[PDB]
Scaffold this active site. Sequence first.
Site, PDB file in Angstrom:
ATOM      1  N   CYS A 105       8.381  28.332 -35.356  1.00  0.00           N
ATOM      2  CA  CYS A 105       6.949  28.718 -35.441  1.00  0.00           C
ATOM      3  C   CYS A 105       6.850  30.246 -35.557  1.00  0.00           C
ATOM      4  CB  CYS A 105       6.171  28.106 -34.280  1.00  0.00           C
ATOM      5  SG  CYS A 105       4.411  27.880 -34.649  1.00  0.00           S
ATOM      6  N   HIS A 125       5.919  29.442 -38.940  1.00  0.00           N
ATOM      7  CA  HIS A 125       4.521  28.980 -39.100  1.00  0.00           C
ATOM      8  C   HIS A 125       3.929  29.757 -40.272  1.00  0.00           C
ATOM      9  CE1 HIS A 125       0.912  26.856 -37.868  1.00  0.00           C
ATOM     10  NE2 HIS A 125       0.306  27.944 -38.342  1.00  0.00           N
TER      11      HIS A 125
END
EC number: 3.1.2.-
Length: 187
Positions: A105, A125
């Site tokens: 992420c 992400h």
Amino acid sequence: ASKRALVILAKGAEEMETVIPVDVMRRAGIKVTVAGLAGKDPVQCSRDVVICPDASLEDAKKEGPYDVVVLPGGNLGAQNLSESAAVKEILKEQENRKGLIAAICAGPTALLAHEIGFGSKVTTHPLAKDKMMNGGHYTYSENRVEKDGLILTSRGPGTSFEFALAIVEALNGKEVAAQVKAPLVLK
């Protein structure tokens, strides 16, 4: 001998991106140390889930070496990892000894901060891409999990299972990963 994983847990870590890899790696028979960046005190995660670490990072880093170092995401978690001298030292040692480094992420932005795995293909992400790609030190990927040698990256809470199973496959092989996967009822 059983493989060993260091999961570095900082204030503001994404609790799903922490617990899913710890749980899935322990299902794979990996010996996992949840190490608190700031010490052994309970850690307040991004959505206020409070996790008690197994050890301080201070103590855990003296019990090396680890087959994988895992960096959960959460923006504030990743920033705490990015600012830590101890994290810098652990990742450089892991890179030097050609050990696996896994980040999910916003987690991979800590690799940028510590100049780890430059020239690797990475994912983050979507919202962490600009930060990760500052200076063009990596090549960006939109794969849910990306593995370029000993840099393993993934995109978000919803890729946490695939991320965890990729670590299991890297350490314990495809068969163990498949065995651990089946009872999870993944799509």
